[PDB]
């Protein structure tokens, strides 16, 4: 943290709570210079213990990313016993939220997948592995732009460390080599993307009704999941390409951006505003 800043309230105004993050709460805020809205993740360092390792990793990684497909980072500010991590505000909800009212259509699935793939291509080109790709960590602006979020367990490859081995992620989305703690790389995110495609198509990842400890033996043992149901052949084949138990046979993000499913079905991100509006209507009438 060679660039930690101080006195954040002199540049930002903290508003209301808009959620809970991995390490504390998330608040809406305002940049007093531009009047744009921002998101502020506030972490009580007193409370943080061994999490500090990951909190430190989260900031490092956010600070090193500059992509329209990754939540922008404004800075980290020290305040009493609190660290304020100030980020891009995205008011459209997560892709998981957007699935709550009902199924997506294939154009929406492809559009969201294309944007996630652009974010993965960026991260992977920077030798970063997200490690927690799932619909909950794909956030949308109110006009439909899609960005990856939640870098708390991200991994960084370097010239001397070409693979990672840490067990991290969310069980249902974890690649088999991550569960086995084998040496893995960005291909683990391609498996998670395949699971996320099934999640965007069906609403939930494979084995979602099982206790997570159970999936830790099911994923390495069983054949890989496939997309079942009445879905187009290119979507089913997209899922199959990602969900190969041999990582080296999974395509890269750059290769998947050329997949027939994406080319035939992805449209402008602005049309995703219809899904954002569907969620707002559904949330408003939810009893
Ligand atoms: N949880 C969140 N809600 C809104 N915008 C965000 N930007 C980063 N995390 C966010």
Whether 132 sits among the annotated catalytic residues: the reply is: yes
C-beta 37 within 6 A of ligand 1: no
- Contact residues for 274 (Cβ-Cβ < 8 A; gap 6+): none
User: What is the helix (H) or strand (E) element at residue 20, kind and residue range?
Assistant: strand 12-20
Cross-strand partners of 26: 19, 41
The CATH class of the 90-287 domain is mainly alpha
Per-residue tokens: 164: 């990672």
Phi, psi torsion values for 274, nearest 5 degrees: -65, -35
Q: Which residues contact 55 (CB under 8 A, 6 or more apart)?
A: 23, 43, 48, 83, 152
| Pairing mode, strands 5-6 and 73-79 | parallel
Query: Measured at the alpha carbon of residue 262, what is the angle toward residues 71 and 128, in degrees to the nearest 5?
Result: 35
Contacts of 146 by beta carbon, 8 Å cutoff, 6+ apart: 69, 95, 111, 112, 115, 116, 119, 138, 139, 140, 269, 272
Structure tokens at 241: 């390409």
Contact at 8 Å (CB) between 261 and 237?
Answer: yes
Ligand 1 within 6 A of 19 CB? Answer: yes
Chain centroid to Cα 150, Å, comes to 6
What residue spans define the domains of the chain?
Answer: 1-89, 90-287
Tell me the helices (H) and strands (E) count for the chain, helix number first.
Answer: 10, 11
CATH number, span 1-89: 3.30.200.20
Catalytic residue among 97, 121, 132, 189: 132
Q: Looking at residue 130, what DSSP letter applies?
A: -
Q: Do domains 1-89 and 90-287 have the same CATH topology?
A: no
Q: Evaluate: CB of 90 within 6 angstroms of ligand 1.
A: yes
State the maximum Cα–Cα separation within the chain, in Å, rounded to a whole number. 56
Cα separation, 149 vs 70, whole angstroms: 6
Method of determination is: X-ray
119/71 Cα distance (integer angstroms): 10
Question: What's the rounded Cα separation, in Å, for the pair 267 and 217?
Answer: 38
Backbone angles phi, psi at 129, to 5 degrees: -125, 130
CA 181 to ligand 1 centroid distance, Å: 30
């Amino acid at each position: 943290m060679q660039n930690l800043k101080a006195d954040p309230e002199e540049l930002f105004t903290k508003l209301e709570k808009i959620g809970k993050g991995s390490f504390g709460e998330v608040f809406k805020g305002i940049d007093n210079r531009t009047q744009k809205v921002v998101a502020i993740k506030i972490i009580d360092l007193e409370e943080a213990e061994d999490e500090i390792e990951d909190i430190q990793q989260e900031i490092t990684v956010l600070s090193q990313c500059d992509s329209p497909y990754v939540t922008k980072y404004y800075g980290s500010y020290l305040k009493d016993t609190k660290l304020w991590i100030i980020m891009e505000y995205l008011g459209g909800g997560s892709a998981l939220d957007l699935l709550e009212p009902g199924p997506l259509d294939e154009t929406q699935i492809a559009t969201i997948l294309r944007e996630i793939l652009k974010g993965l291509d960026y991260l992977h080109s920077e030798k970063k592995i997200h490690r927690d790709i799932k619909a909950a960590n794909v956030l949308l602006s109110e006009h439909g732009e899609v960005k990856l979020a939640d870098f708390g367990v991200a991994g960084q490859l370097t010239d001397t460390q070409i693979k990672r081995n840490t067990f991290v992620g969310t069980p249902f989305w974890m690649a088999p080599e991550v569960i086995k703690q084998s040496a893995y790389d960005s291909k683990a995110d391609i498996w998670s993307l395949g699971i996320t495609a099934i999640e965007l198509a069906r609403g939930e990842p494979p084995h979602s009704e099982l206790h997570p400890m159970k999936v830790l033996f099911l994923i390495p043992k069983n054949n890989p999941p496939t997309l079942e149901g009445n879905y187009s052949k290119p979507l089913k084949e997209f899922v199959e390409a990602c969900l190969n138990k041999e990582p080296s046979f999974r395509p890269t993000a750059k290769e998947l951006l050329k997949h027939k499913f994406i080319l035939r079905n992805a449209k402008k991100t602005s049309y995703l505003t219809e899904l954002i509006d569907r969620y707002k209507r559904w949330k408003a009438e939810q009893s």
